[PDB]
């Protein structure tokens, strides 16, 4: 007696800290209870903070996500007179682009592609979505597997401001931050294929 919703887009993550929030408005905007499940609908994800995979608030937290975690995950949103079961596929890849081209990012989904506008003052964004329990330090930026060092490049919060965007700014970017959780530190590294439009 629960309405099943199957999500068409899979979520890709490198083998590192990862989190997914059960945000499905307006279904999750009322007075509801959110419960995550891994390839199951009978045993909920543990809430033990020291567990590698656990539920934190309305989020599923992987510290880190590892090979074998790929599958269908369900968020059961229970209201007073309603029940919804959201099925989302979460896929992990083992390798990072700067270490090797093998067994890494399986496809260039929108969460791994960005665009910079030619001749304009534009910026890149580092997408780090984690619950409050995870504290993210400053972000280091890389282009073509080397640290970015330049006059036109400035770091500001989660963005990399790029002034006077040139056609030579195309390439593979990487943003890296240290994530702290329960006194323990983890490293998050996201790649971006950056293209330029005039």
């Amino acid at each position, epitope marked *: 007696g629960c309405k099943d919703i199957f999500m068409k887009n899979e979520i890709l993550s490198a083998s590192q800290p990862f989190a997914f929030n059960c945000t499905f408005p307006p279904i999750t905007s009322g007075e509801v209870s959110v419960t995550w499940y891994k390839n199951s609908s009978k045993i909920p994800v543990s809430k033990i903070i020291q567990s590698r995979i656990h539920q934190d608030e309305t989020w599923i937290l992987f510290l880190p996500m590892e090979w074998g975690d790929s599958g269908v995950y369900q968020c059961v949103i229970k209201g007073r007179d309603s029940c919804h079961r959201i099925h989302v596929n979460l896929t992990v890849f083992e390798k990072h682009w700067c270490d090797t*081209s093998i067994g890494g*990012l*399986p*496809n*260039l989904s929108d969460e*791994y592609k960005q665009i910079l506008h030619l001749g304009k003052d534009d910026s890149l964004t580092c997408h780090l979505h984690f619950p409050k329990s995870c504290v993210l330090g400053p972000i280091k930026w890389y282009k*073509d*597997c080397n640290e970015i060092k330049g006059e036109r490049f400035t770091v500001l919060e989660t963005r990399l401001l790029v002034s006077n965007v040139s056609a030579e700014d195309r390439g*593979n970017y990487a943003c890296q931050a240290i994530l702290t959780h329960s006194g323990k530190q983890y490293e998050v590294l996201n790649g971006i*294929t950056v293209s330029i439009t005039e």
Partner: antibody
Amino acid sequence: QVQLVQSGAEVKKPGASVKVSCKASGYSFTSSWIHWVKQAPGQGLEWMGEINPGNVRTNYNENFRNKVTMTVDTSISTAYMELSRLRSDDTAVYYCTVVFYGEPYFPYWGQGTLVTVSS
Amino acid sequence: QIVLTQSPGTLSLSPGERATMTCTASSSVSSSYFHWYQQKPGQAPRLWIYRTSRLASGVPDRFSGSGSGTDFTLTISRLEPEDAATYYCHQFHRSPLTFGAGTKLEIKR
């Protein structure tokens, strides 16, 4: 258009070394991994290794661990594959290929270079 | 090393017939890392099927790719003369990258 143009065929004496070039074009040279593939005559495909022109990181197949050296010249968008201490079974056609982020496959290949090890 | 066992080694069939070639991997290979290449004599290999079932640009609809885990297949629903070539399976999942020994498709006319 992404293109990989290799150097011409060569003949080298046993014990000698050979360097095959792969000039790239149609994309940003430092934003990709260049791979090398060996095709022995009458045989199929054997993967030799990869080089990232951005950070010059190389990863070789353990079979070519002490035989191959991969380098790049970013100024002329060219990858190089060098075989040392040549022997009969190094006679083969050698190909270069390029890989892009989020596309783990070989869509573009060079034309091949036949290396003959002969006295 | 993920060994790829490709079979048959040779296939001789008439035009309009169905061609089937399998590739058995020693360890499980994720579907996004399993590909097929077509190679005609004197030429470089050409990407044919990528991500197990996606057709590369210029690849006719009669070609179909399927599979998961350790078992993959390339199918030609109705052979045309231009299909005569050697085909190779390939895995991009774990180093070192490996290919199958090939299936040489000969056309009986």
